[PDB]
Amino acid sequence: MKEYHIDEEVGFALPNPQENLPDFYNDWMFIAKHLPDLIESGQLRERVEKLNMLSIDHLTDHKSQRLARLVLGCITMAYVWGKGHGDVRKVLPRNIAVPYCQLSKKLELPPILVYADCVLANWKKKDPNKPLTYENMDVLFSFRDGDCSKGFFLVSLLVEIAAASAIKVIPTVFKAMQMQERDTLLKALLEIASCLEKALQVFHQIHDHVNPKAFFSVLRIYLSGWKGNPQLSDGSAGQSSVFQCFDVLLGIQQTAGGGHAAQFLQDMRRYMPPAHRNFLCSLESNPSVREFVLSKGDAGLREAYDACVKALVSLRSYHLQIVTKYILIPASQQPTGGTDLMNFLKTVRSTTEKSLLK
Template sequence: MAAAEPDSKPFFSLESYHVSEELGFILADPLQELPPYYQPWMDIALRVPELVHSHELRFHVNKMPQLSSQFLQKHRELRLAHLALSMMTMGYMWQEGENNTVKMLPHNLAVPFWEVSQRLGLPPILTHADAVLANWRKKDPEGPFDMENLEVLVSLPGGDSTRGFFLVTLLVEMAAVPALRNIPTVINGVRCGDAETVARALEVISQSLQDMTDKLKLMQVYVEPSVFYGIMRIYLSGWKDNPCMPKGLVYEGVQDEPMEYSGGSAAQSSLLHCFDELLGVKHEAKSGAFLTRMRNYMPPAHKLLTQDISLQPSLKRFVQQQASERLNQAFQHCVTKLLALRSYHINVVSRFITVPAARARQLRNQNQELEGEMISRAPTALEERGTGGSGIMIFLKTVRDQTKGTLLPETSQ
């Protein structure tokens, strides 16, 4: 029997996708503590930066007790466990930099990490859903959702810049909430043929995309490029498409063959995937394949939302069929704001990766390690790549250009 047309469904809503009206994809009220049985995990996870700095993290993990994950019951417990185990894993892997990686994650970390990952439908590596969406608390519970009142729960080496990187990314997610709330309005408006409602919702989405770009600009305030490039970046990188670990990583006690997982990447945020599907942005084969693979690093309900948006009637076709100047303008505005966000992201990557990479090469060629010691110690394998494993500038520019291709053809004035 043929599947029903998507627009025959009564109403598209975000309820079944674990998306909150107030927080979007952000996990509401993340737990700060696990049940007492899991204290050995939290004791180490909360000390990852200092234990990496003193080269003692591997020692502490190796003598950590083997704990069963069966006493983790609630979703938020599993998310905090995944965050703690993933931060420990990244610190364990990269404690000695790119030249002294380990081939195997010990069973007392690997087995529970794998079990928790299976239950959440997430991979056993640090993801955007861990480091950003589930890694925050308000200092004053009644206070605002801003940099002064937010703190991370678990961190990695890099001090204030690491905190800044995770929290600014969280604020970008928060700025997107009005846009997310209006996606169902657009979809249902298209189904009903209501051009006015669709135009109004697209105007809200445009403003939200502008607000996301404005929040992203805080990276310049809260993150030091030399710290991001020289210290933080390696702890966000994974064991797929990484020359430091060409075969991947063996999860001891899980399976004997090494497994490959990509490191954290902005492409793991469901936001831009949702906007691309809504606006009809078509990605070319290589960048599209990478983006599709990144969906496996999202919570399953969020991944499903991006897929289900893609099954809806075409918004762009609807806009082209309506004789509505307001709707035309609202659609163009949306694509233009998405384009501006992607262009600014390229600017950020240039500032935090391309420029420091060139400086690091220059210092190594001159054997200088004075002011640039931090930069020149950065992993050479990551110089032209994102932490997700992509050739970063080519990828970002291709994705931006595909977004540009979504603009409506210029109509005669």
Template sequence: MDTKVKNTETLLSLGQFHISEDCGCILPEPLTDLPLYYKPWMDIARNVPELISSHSLRLRIHNMPLLETHLLRTHCELRLAHLALSMMTVGYVWQEGERETIKVLPRNLSVPFCEVSQRLGLPPILIYTDAVLANWKKRDPDGPFSMENLELLLTLPGGESLRGFFLVTLMVELAAVPGLKSILDVINGIHYNDVAMVTKALDVVSQAIDSMKQAFKLMHDYVDPSIFYGIVRIYLSGWKDNPLMPEGLVYEEVQEKPMEFSGSSAAQSSTLHCFDELLGVQHEGSSGAFLRRMRDYMLPSHKHFIENISSRPSLRSFVLQQADEGLTHTFEQCVARLVDFRNYHINTVTRYITIPASRAKQLRANKQGLPEELDAIRRAPTALEERGTGGSGIMTFLKTVRDKTKDTSISQGSKGNQVLPDPSINTEGCI
């Protein structure tokens, strides 16, 4: 018990864990450029889509000088360097799609990338922390956080759909910020046995999860399913549990044996892990193991925040012990909204992966369809049809995660806590 009290007293602010009061897990005000010495990196990183299109990215990287990394002195410099090196890496690996896959990352990319990764405590691959959390800028610095006022620092093939995919995900993270801040109030409220404090804070968490779903809906306005499936997805794929690269990737002059890393995945969002730990969602089996492994793809400070939440007295047990009607209702609403968010995620994956995969099989069989659609589908890696970018069997994984969230409900089976998929999305025959 003394340990629990000590932990509560030392959890003073989100800032301890490099989580912003205004931006949550997003890197506030990322740098837009590195010191002049690193111009060779930035010149290539800013032109990855064009260099891939001209099939010249690999040649440019081979001719790139091997740069020292000790001149990167700040956290923000390291984050931009990691983003730039990771964009070059996935571009280099997937330049020719599933054809002509490579086995070795050249030393002038692998050595600095691994050095920067080690300093940050991150793996040397493009991850959610790079692509979403540190890859943005405002067009008007004084303007709002909105899709119209946001731009990517670095990009990959996929045009506006690629931009939309990363920035909508950023908007989902922003919507979660009030909920992240309220986690501290929930923890303190439990410590001081303050039912009103916990209820009020949980209500904010519940509203934040609902706001995340509303932000998530923007995906359908900004991301074309055939472009995402046929072009974008392969660049988010890694070299672990990937049939296209069964042996992994050798990082030249770093390690002789191939290394395996998962690609960028929403499972690497610290925010969702925080809400799961707060509510007591118990992920087990292969899905639980995958989610725990994804914590190694987060900033160490964010991972520590998740672990800190996990070490606290159980919120669910507190709700059961108090038997307070208002508190119980708010807790149940929180769980129901997280289930609803995950149902919506399943429906979105159906639209962006399951349905396009089925369409791809039809097009390959009949060779019919619009030329643009045929071209995008033709480029889609057939080996990844049933997998998420992190390497998971996507539908089985998402449904298991959703069902485990449902199990957290105190009054399981009660009609008021059943949350159905969004009826606006037709998933008949797809899930």
């Protein structure tokens, strides 16, 4: 499906991403690289304002353009937030502004650190002929020390990658539908569910690598989309495609409704690469797997469909426990409306659960 920029092995994630910019952008790299210390000390802001307005042109191809969105990305948040206690003032200088606001409008992304940046493009396997495991993976850019931004980015990543096993049968699904192949479609739906259960195991690792109290107080403030004030020019899991992909594959209508829950999810598409946005919709353009599976009156097909929905609902429900442990509890011990959030996340679990057909 490579015109949508999906990869057999590594899903929506950018495969084997650039980790060296050109030389002309050695200025940029050596802020971003040594960024735990520039924030800690305070000589980050210093060093950004004491810089020049580099052109984006020398960035040739995609992989290189995207690394640039990352480097500029971590720099922007770190600059604007600072140490993340009071200093959060003062809009970016036009040194970093125009590149980011140029390169963002080029790659059709927002001028802001997104999932596509800080997870998808933000990794490398250390020993190039070793497997996609936690040992043999590391991120390109952290923010502080003990922000657990390695564990976080990489567990996030490894889920995209488990999902990649399911995503890659989806043509087999739509193929076997139009060509009236019950047996083919049936296996294809058990494959998906059997992979989406695999996706939950990877998810368990979050406990192991990401520290609860660390994440809340330290790291999340730099991924907080539009907290603060941009003040530049004319005006992060859950920006993931993985969940909305299979929302749509299984004809589960989240974004259909007159509700906040729904519109939030459809807005999240604007934080995705354009190619993924494109992909998602293509799925919607296709005949409904849900409606098809219903018409046939085939007990074993509903079973294999209900298995994919089970699998999703499973993921969503676990996701909540993770939020309890990594937001709610930590959020308490931190000297009104509060958590409508858990409403939101349930409202979406709920809606997925409703799409079961016994």
